[PDB]
Symmetry: D2
Subunit: 33 residues, 4 copies
């Protein structure tokens, strides 16, 4: 119930953290240019 949504939202927070991390890696690539 609520637990199904807790699992699904946790997955999305994990996905969102990957977005931020990977954008940061691109920022370093660009900062260097």
């Amino acid at each position: 119930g609520i637990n199904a949504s807790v699992v699904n939202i946790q997955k999305e927070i994990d996905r969102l953290n990957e977005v931020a991390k990977n954008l940061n890696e691109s920022l370093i690539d660009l900062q260097e240019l």
Copy 2:
């Protein structure tokens, strides 16, 4: 160069759009509860 970062950022925008879409699906699951 810039093209490598354009590809990598596009991938992250695609990932971010999945975050928003999937959170919205969980919101519907919760709104219904």
Copy 3:
């Protein structure tokens, strides 16, 4: 506690709205970089 579910729906909705605004801005930066790129 049912007030609780409604509160979290409203809260998460606000975050989705902010994610959508981020995605719009990132798409704009992508265009900016393409203009440098080609």
Copy 4:
């Protein structure tokens, strides 16, 4: 146009900051839902 790369770095940095703030808020909503959940 080099000003251009720097501008996009600053712009994307602002968006990463906003994503990090979203993630913090979503983590808080996750805790709220867990409190309903268990």
